Amino acid sequence: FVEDWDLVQTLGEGAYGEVQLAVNRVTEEAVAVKIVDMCPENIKKEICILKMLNHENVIKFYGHRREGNIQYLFMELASGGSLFDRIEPDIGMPEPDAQRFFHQLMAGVVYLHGIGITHRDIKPHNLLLDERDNLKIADYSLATVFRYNNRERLLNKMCGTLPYVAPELLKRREFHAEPVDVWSCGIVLTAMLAGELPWDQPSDSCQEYSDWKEKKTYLNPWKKIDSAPLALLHKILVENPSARITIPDIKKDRWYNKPLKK
């Protein structure tokens, strides 16, 4: 990046920093670049995690360039943009398209969980689409290790995005990482099927969250969602993380296994 790259436009922000669409001044190859003025501990950590990743539903990491204090992180550019931009406000998207994306989401989250990594900020802005509309989970700024040498560590830090965060994260000093990512996937599913988020945060003081706990599914967004995927959302958006559905049991759900698409 001495001046091999032209910064063409802003793609988005992660938890930490900004990512740009960079076009190479020599070959015109277009990539995404995250540019960070060196926290050194965090970016070091982000890089180490980014190097662990290799899966069809995780965004490709090309590498990094340290130049002065500033670190440059290079990634595959998602030619289909983000899932956020496929969700029509107040409508969502067609159910077969939502189910395919949800399958792919689950594949990527199983992969991360399997290498002991939790993402911590799953939401449509961070789920990217390639030229064939395959979903790729991006933005590892909040990702961390939850399992190492086969021993689980609990998480003890609040982070993410409020409409997507699980309730235990707001209430418990320490909590299990996997059920928090499961919960955010359910909020993504809700967005895809209804084009609207159900609550500002899953707290007792938020009426929309109380309404769900009281099973008022004749209200929006729930009323927009067919009974089969709603039944899955009933198992995912369970307040007590120990009673929440796990990914192996999502894979057995009726809707998850319903044939919808070519």
Ligand SMILES: C[C@@H]1CN(c2cc(-c3n[nH]c4ccc(OC5(C)CC5)cc34)ncn2)C[C@H](C)O1
């Ligand atoms: C319309 C425009 C939208 N687009 C994109 C691409 C990307 C993107 N690619 N790779 C990334 C790697 C990391 C990344 O970290 C986020 C999710 C924090 C923004 C974004 C991208 N993020 C949004 N929009 C691609 C061009 C062709 O089309």
Ligand SMILES: [Cl-]
């Ligand atoms: Cl390990």
Ligand SMILES: [Cl-]
């Ligand atoms: Cl949305």
